[PDB]
Subunit: 128 residues, 2 copies
């Protein structure tokens, strides 16, 4: 891995302090836009989480992968970060139950970072 | 018309009007072909998705149903707009065995699937195919 966005989304998910982020600046904006997202679509996350809660508990890796992949495909930058913001909690509970590396959803991540410039575009100029 | 060509095609598909007696027959068809296509190419996800929406389907918990289908909704793209309509279709066709359920119950979601008529129509006609 290199990219720049992808580096940022890992540290974001594996929850790394600023100043250990090689892409610290981009990281922030990710977390910003994300938080902002998490704000304006609160309903949707609540209902998604409860939905995945059986698969989250139970460590049902496949269903979680399939839930999160449904979204992506030829997604718009907007859902790409929704699914990202989702994947962030999804990973927080998985850590509390068995150490879980972001890399485990590397496919979801690839689906998130695809068309990287359009995504970086969105976090930077828009998502407000 | 408070109904666009596609919107009519969407409701008729969701309420399962017979091809015969649909004022947009040719669009119904396309719409139903691209849908069958998706479902088959992405059986994996649609399997896990219904499994995971099932509590809410049984129980008839319509709001969480909207919240769930709405998730990928505001920008989306002819692509996301069509997966969701494939799902909505399964969902509404078993909300009906439990109880009569009109596509109109999902008006909002439908507006979602259906904004950008010519982009969505384009996508069904030229591009949901890969031979």
């Amino acid at each position: 891995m290199m990219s720049r966005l992808k580096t940022a989304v890992y540290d974001y998910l594996n929850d790394v302090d600023i100043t250990e982020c090689t892409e610290m600046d981009l990281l922030c904006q990710l977390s910003n836009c994300c938080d902002f997202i998490n704000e304006t679509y609160a309903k949707n996350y609540d209902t998604l989480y409860d939905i995945m809660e059986r698969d989250i508990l139970s460590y049902n890796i496949v269903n979680i992968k399939n839930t999160l992949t449904f979204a992506l495909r030829d997604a718009s930058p907007s859902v790409k970060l929704a699914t990202l913001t989702l994947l962030a909690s999804v990973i927080k509970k998985l850590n509390k139950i068995q150490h879980t590396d972001a890399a485990m959803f590397s496919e979801v991540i690839d689906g998130i970072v695809a068309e990287e410039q359009q995504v970086i575009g969105f976090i930077q100029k828009k998502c407000k």
